[PDB]
């Protein structure tokens, strides 16, 4: 690895995702190849998230990718902010189609016409559906793998309820699931809050989000969204049901939508990566422990059989293990090779170590070498793997606890912002006031989220940073990624 993280971060990120065999560059700008090393992280998120949403009653399905030109113009506010971001298919071959067809930037306009046919009574509720698919967002910003891409994989769960109470209860349920994915699988602490009126989902009531922080660039990034659509989309697609007790009364449905993309892997690379390469948390690592024979220079057949000893012993306790037993490369090459890929534990077996009933476990995060007896293999490695997961989170929590501050004035909010930090400021919550913030912070700082539990309680009567309107709440501000 030639680039450093504190110096050239952009070139460091490109070398890390490629040398770790996670990302391969295509030739259409905005598209990237998810190699099996990075795809195994996405499946680990799928098998965890799917097991949680199916407890809540959500069922997986799949909807068409194509949207007709008439279906996109059904919800006016939904097509406003999405019009410049949508890609249209106008012909197949050299034959122009009947009507231009769009690729889905989101499946709200595709499913809700079907929700209207399925919802006809109170018994046909609640509907809870989810799908793992791909979407196209034709944005004119600089693409970066995982983080910002035109095409990306995600999940989108759409749920219609008969009451606003049960709909509001699922919004916070899904948002806390997204928090578990970042904190308990990726070891990334995030801040849960609400979006402002300018950066909320178009055509919806309110948007909840989780904001992760990257100390290498001093920028924050949104990791997931969970919107409460209210009756906005159900009033335009005629998603109504009959009241169970009152005869003849028909009430509109209350709908929610929530999503989580593959930038979860990107934030993991940005938060835990170092100048030695990738760093995978043991919870999502494709290979947790790699076994490498050392000191090879004819008693070698026993050393290989002893590496196969640790390999099968770790498989029975259900620990993802890989045995690199290639004779083409030196043990020093394998050390560099698997450190770039982020394998949490390196299991070194030497000739004298084998005959001594001991081995060496090297931690990817700290580089510490711990000699472990042969009998304690399954139990000590299970303890170090759990310790690496927490260590990556505590160190990430320390960088988030110290880079998030409070500022009540504009110049002190401006000063701390240029020091690579995100700030919570008393904010009035107006669009015309937020545009001025991004105009004077310059690249300019945008709103991140209105945190549920802010760092400090807002003083009653305290004004906003603009000095003209009274402040409504503390809003986390900063530059986005």
Ligand X SMILES: Cc1ccccc1CNC(=O)c1nccnc1NCc1ccccc1C
Residue 199 interacting with ligand X (CB under 6 A) = no
Tokens found for residue 153: 């994989």
Cα 223 to the chain's mean position, in Å? 4
Query: Regarding beta strands 240-242 and 250-252, do their DSSP bridges make them parallel or antiparallel, or are they unpaired?
Result: antiparallel
Q: 225 is in the binding site of which of ligand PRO, a second copy, Sr ion, none (Cβ under 5 to 8 A by kind)?
A: ligand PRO
Measured from the CB atom, is 10 or 89 closer to a second copy? 89
At closest approach, how far in Å is the CB of 154 from ligand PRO?
7
Q: How many residues bind ligand X (CB under 6 A)?
A: 18
- What long-range pairs does 27-34 form, CB within 8 A, spacing at least 24? 29/143, 29/150, 30/143, 30/149, 30/150, 30/151, 31/149, 31/150, 31/151, 32/145, 32/149, 34/153, 34/262
Q: 39 is in the binding site of which of ligand X, Zn ion, a second copy, none (Cβ under 5 to 8 A by kind)?
A: a second copy
Looking up tokens 């690379």, which residue turns up? 269
Residue 258 interacting with ligand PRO (CB under 6 A) = yes
Residue 261 interacting with ligand X (CB under 6 A) = yes
Does residue 106 have a known ligand-binding role?
A: yes
Tokens found for residue 213: 């922080």
Q: 148 is in the binding site of which of Sr ion, ligand X, a second copy, none (Cβ under 5 to 8 A by kind)?
A: ligand X
Tokens found for residue 5: 């993280």
Measured from the CB atom, is 154 or 359 closer to ligand X? 154
Instruction: Give the CA distances from residue 473 to residues 107, 152, 157, in Å, rounded to whole numbers and listed in that order.
Output: 33, 34, 30
Q: Which stretch binds ligand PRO (CB under 6 A): 94-102, 254-262, 389-397, 403-411?
A: 254-262
| Residue among 481, 396, 480, 473 at smallest CA distance from 193 | 473
Residue 145 interacting with ligand X (CB under 6 A) = no
Q: Which stretch binds a second copy (CB under 8 A): 67-75, 246-254, 356-364, 377-385?
A: 67-75
Residue 242 interacting with a second copy (CB under 8 A) = no
Residue 257 interacting with ligand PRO (CB under 6 A) = yes
Does residue 395 have a known ligand-binding role?
A: no
Helix H, strand E, coil C: the string for 143-156 is CECCCECCEEEEEE
Q: Which one-letter DSSP state was computed for residue 427? A: E
Contacts of ligand PRO in 199-228 (CB under 6 A): 201, 225, 227
Other beta carbons within 10 angstroms of residue 112's beta carbon come to 26
**Which contiguous run of DSSP H or E holds residue 80?**
helix 76-80
Contacts of ligand X in 283-312 (CB under 6 A): none
Does residue 107 have a known ligand-binding role?
A: yes
Preceding amide of 223 cis, omega within 30: no
- Binding a second copy (rule: CB under 8 A), the pick from 57, 100, 444, 470 is 100
Residue 86 interacting with a second copy (CB under 8 A) = yes
Q: 259 is in the binding site of which of Sr ion, ligand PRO, Zn ion, none (Cβ under 5 to 8 A by kind)?
A: ligand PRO
Q: Per-residue x/- marks for ligand X, 18-47, CB under 6 A?
A: ------------x-----------------
- Binding ligand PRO (rule: CB under 6 A), the pick from 156, 205, 339, 348 is 156
- Binding ligand X (rule: CB under 6 A), the pick from 152, 241, 254, 477 is 152
- Binding Sr ion (rule: CB under 5 A), the pick from 29, 57, 134, 398 is 57
| Residue among 331, 346, 159 at smallest CA distance from 259 | 159
Q: 428 is in the binding site of which of ligand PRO, a second copy, Zn ion, none (Cβ under 5 to 8 A by kind)?
A: Zn ion
Residue 105 interacting with ligand X (CB under 6 A) = no
Does residue 222 have a known ligand-binding role?
A: yes
Q: Is 123 exposed, middle or buried, given 0-12, 13-18 or 19+ CB atoms closer than 10 A?
A: exposed
Instruction: Give the CA distances from residue 306 to residues 110, 293, 311, 357, in Å, rounded to whole numbers and listed in that order.
Output: 57, 9, 9, 10
Tokens found for residue 188: 């990334």
Helix (H, G, I), strand (E, B) or coil at 457: coil
At closest approach, how far in Å is the CB of 320 from ligand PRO?
29
Does residue 320 have a known ligand-binding role?
A: no
Per-position DSSP letters for 187-198, written without gaps between them = ---EEEEE--SS
Contacts for 377 with CB less than 8 Å, ≥ 6 apart: 310, 313, 314, 359
| Residue ranges in contact with Zn ion by CB under 5 A | 428, 433, 464, 466, 469
Binding-site residues sit at 106-108, 137, 139, 148-149, 222, 225, 227, 261, 263, 428, 433, 464, 466
Binding-site residues for Mg(2+) sit at 222
| Residue ranges in contact with ligand PRO by CB under 6 A | 106, 108, 156, 201, 225, 227, 257-259
| Residue ranges in contact with ligand X by CB under 6 A | 30, 137, 139, 141, 143, 148-150, 152, 222-225, 259-263
Binding-site residues for L-proline sit at 106-108, 137, 227
């Amino acid at each position: 690895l030639e680039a450093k993280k504190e110096e050239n971060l952009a070139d460091w990120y490109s070398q890390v995702i490629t040398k770790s065999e996670m990302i391969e560059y295509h030739d259409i700008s905005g598209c990237y190849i998810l190699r099996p090393w990075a795809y195994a992280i996405w499946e680990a998120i799928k098998d965890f998230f799917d097991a949680e949403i199916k407890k809540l009653g959500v069922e997986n399905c799949y909807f068409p990718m194509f949207v007709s030109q008439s279906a996109l113009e059904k919800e006016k506010t939904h097509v406003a902010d999405f019009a410049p971001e949508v890609a249209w298919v106008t012909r197949s071959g050299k034959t122009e189609l009947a009507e231009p067809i769009a690729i889905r930037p989101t499946s709200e306009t595709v499913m809700y016409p079907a929700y209207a046919k399925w919802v006809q009574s109170h018994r046909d509720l609640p509907i809870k559906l989810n799908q793992w698919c791909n979407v196209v967002r034709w944005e004119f910003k600089h693409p970066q793998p995982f983080l910002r891409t035109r095409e990306f994989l995600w999940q989108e769960g759409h749920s219609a309820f008969a009451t606003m109470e049960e709909a509001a209860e699922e919004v916070l349920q899904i948002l806390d699931l997204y928090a578990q994915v970042y904190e308990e699988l990726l070891a990334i602490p995030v801040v849960k809050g609400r979006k402002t009126e300018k950066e909320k989902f178009a055509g919806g009531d309110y948007t909840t989000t989780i904001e992760a922080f990257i100390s290498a660039s001093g920028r924050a990034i949104q990791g997931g969204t969970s919107h409460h659509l209210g009756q906005n989309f159900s009033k335009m697609f005629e998603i109504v049901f009959e009241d169970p007790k009152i005869p003849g009364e028909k009430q509109f449905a209350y709908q929610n939508s929530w999503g989580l993309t593959t930038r979860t892997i990107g934030v993991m690379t940005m938060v835990h990566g170092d100048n030695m390469g990738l760093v995978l948390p043991p919870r999502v690592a494709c290979v947790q422990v790699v076994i490498i024979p050392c000191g090879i220079t004819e008693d070698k057949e026993a050393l290989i059989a002893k590496c196969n000893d640790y390999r099968r012993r770790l498989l029975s306790v259900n620990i993802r293990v890989r045995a690199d037993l290639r004779d083409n490369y030196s043990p020093g090459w394998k050390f560099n090779h698997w450190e770039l890929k982020g394998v949490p534990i390196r299991l070194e077996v030497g000739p004298r170590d084998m005959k001594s009933c001991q081995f060496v476990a090297v931690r990817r995060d700290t580089g510490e070498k711990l000699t472990v007896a042969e009998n304690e293999a399954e139990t000590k490695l299970q303890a170090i793997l759990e310790d690496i997961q927490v260590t990556l989170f505590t160190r990430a929590s320390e960088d988030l606890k110290t880079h998030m501050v409070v500022a009540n004035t504009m110049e002190d909010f401006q000063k701390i912002l240029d020091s690579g930090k995100i700030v919570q400021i008393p904010f009035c919550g107006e669009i015309d006031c937020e545009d001025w913030i991004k105009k004077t912070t310059a690249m300019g700082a945008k709103s991140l989220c209105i945190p549920f539990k802010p760092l400090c309680e807002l003083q009653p009567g305290a004004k906003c940073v603009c000095g003209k309107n009274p402040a409504k709440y503390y809003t986390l501000f900063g530059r986005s990624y």
